[PDB]
């Protein structure tokens, strides 16, 4: 096929793969129990991303959805990735501030809605309706970020500054990166079709890589992960 975005898919596969191996290697040398539990969660994130980027690179996860009078190329393998990666990231942050089970359950549940309605909207054939679903998915995300900002930041205050400081950074990187996804979707292939797929893939690989390997590097190199 040789689609114009393939280069970005290969670069995302490459980065996720390398990020996975370094986390894996670093994680299996650690003896601390708690450290092992962030290391296992954080390594799995780029591992899943790698498989999905690889599949997309190889021609899967792509579907032609009709709307706007066009046959639009929608990469659905992305949500198969994010459904597990976003929730895992959320768990990492939750375990960091000692978030309560109810919180974790509610956060992960909201996250399922976000990704679920997101895909439904990326698959919807009525143009305007695609934006109705997108709207509900973004609302779900804003709920998630509100909790991370108001809830979590508050509980990280019962933590040592080292843990409170690591969380702030991960929280900040998360709020900034996640905020970007809905806008990429809106102006790109799933939405207005303003930004082309090849450029859109580039924007998504940058956010994905940053949000996973960027996030993991920061978290795994911190002492806040120790029991
Ligand atoms: C590794 C992947 C990460 C951290 C992905 C984060 C993805 C989001 C915050 C996605 C959000 C979306 C919306 C708010 C609405 C429309 C569709 C999505 C799924 C792109």
């Amino acid at each position: 096929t040789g689609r114009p975005e393939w280069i970005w898919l290969a670069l995302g596969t490459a980065l996720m793969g390398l990020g996975t191996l370094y986390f894996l290697v670093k994680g299996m040398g650690v003896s601390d129990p708690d450290a092992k539990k962030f290391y296992a969660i954080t390594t799995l994130v780029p591992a899943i991303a790698f498989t999905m980027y690889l599949s997309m690179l190889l021609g899967y996860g792509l579907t032609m959805v009709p709307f706007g009078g066009e046959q639009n190329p929608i990469y659905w393998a992305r949500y198969a990735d994010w459904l597990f990666t976003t929730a895992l990231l959320l768990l990492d942050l939750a375990l960091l501030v000692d978030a309560d089970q109810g919180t974790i359950l509610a956060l992960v549940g909201a996250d399922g809605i976000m990704i679920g309605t997101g895909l439904v909207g990326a698959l919807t054939k009525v143009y305007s309706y695609r934006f109705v679903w997108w709207a509900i998915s973004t609302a779900a995300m804003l709920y998630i970020l509100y909790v991370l900002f108001f809830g979590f930041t508050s509980k990280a205050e019962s933590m040592r500054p080292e843990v409170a400081s690591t969380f702030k950074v991960l929280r900040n990187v998360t709020v900034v990166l996640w905020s970007a996804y809905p806008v990429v979707w809106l102006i790109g292939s799933e939405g207005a079709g303003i930004v082309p797929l090849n450029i859109e893939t580039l924007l998504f690989m940058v956010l994905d890589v940053s949000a996973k390997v960027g996030f993991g590097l920061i978290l795994l190199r911190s002492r806040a992960i120790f029991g």
Side-chain angles (χ1 to χ4, degrees):
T1 293
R3 298 181 108 300
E5 71 274 20
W6 82 256
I7 192 71
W8 299 127
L9 259 27
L11 214 203
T13 307
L15 300 174
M16 293 301 195
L18 293 177
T20 300
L21 299 179
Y22 179 58
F23 290 167
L24 204 215
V25 175
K26 193 170 179 186
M28 295 193 78
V30 164
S31 61
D32 185 54
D34 265 49
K36 273 294 181 72
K37 197 176 260 176
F38 299 109
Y39 264 108
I41 296 168
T42 310
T43 302
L44 178 48
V45 170
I48 297 157
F50 171 80
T51 68
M52 297 301 88
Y53 258 95
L54 205 181
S55 295
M56 288 192 270
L57 177 61
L58 286 183
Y60 292 77
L62 174 65
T63 192
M64 303 297 132
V65 177
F67 68 81
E70 307 297 328
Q71 234 45 34
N72 311 96
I74 300 304
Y75 274 109
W76 64 266
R78 288 191 194 285
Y79 307 84
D81 178 324
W82 306 337
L83 178 64
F84 309 103
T85 59
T86 53
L88 286 167
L89 288 168
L90 255 30
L91 179 59
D92 259 333
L93 291 178
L95 298 178
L96 208 60
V97 301
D98 185 52
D100 310 292
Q101 197 160 307
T103 307
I104 295 179
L105 210 201
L107 260 180
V108 179
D111 189 273
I113 290 179
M114 172 180 99
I115 300 303
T117 51
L119 182 58
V120 174
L123 301 182
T124 303
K125 302 171 180 179
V126 184
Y127 211 158
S128 58
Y129 284 5
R130 297 182 61 83
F131 295 110
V132 157
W133 288 109
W134 170 87
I136 303 166
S137 175
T138 303
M141 179 197 82
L142 295 173
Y143 166 70
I144 290 163
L145 300 185
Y146 180 91
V147 164
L148 251 38
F149 191 73
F150 280 88
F152 281 38
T153 307
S154 188
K155 222 170 182 298
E157 295 312 323
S158 66
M159 306 294 123
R160 295 292 293 189
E162 163 35 47
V163 176
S165 57
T166 298
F167 166 56
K168 79 196 179 188
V169 174
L170 294 184
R171 178 201 68 189
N172 286 175
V173 171
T174 306
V175 169
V176 177
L177 291 181
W178 287 44
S179 291
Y181 289 80
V183 177
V184 175
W185 196 106
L186 199 63
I187 69 184
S189 284
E190 297 63 67
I194 294 170
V195 180
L197 188 46
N198 67 297
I199 285 175
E200 160 167 41
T201 302
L202 145 64
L203 302 179
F204 272 142
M205 86 127 243
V206 176
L207 297 167
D208 283 345
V209 176
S210 290
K212 292 181 178 67
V213 186
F215 180 107
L217 289 177
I218 305 177
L219 169 67
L220 300 178
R221 62 178 290 174
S222 71
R223 53 258 242 252
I225 66 174
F226 293 74

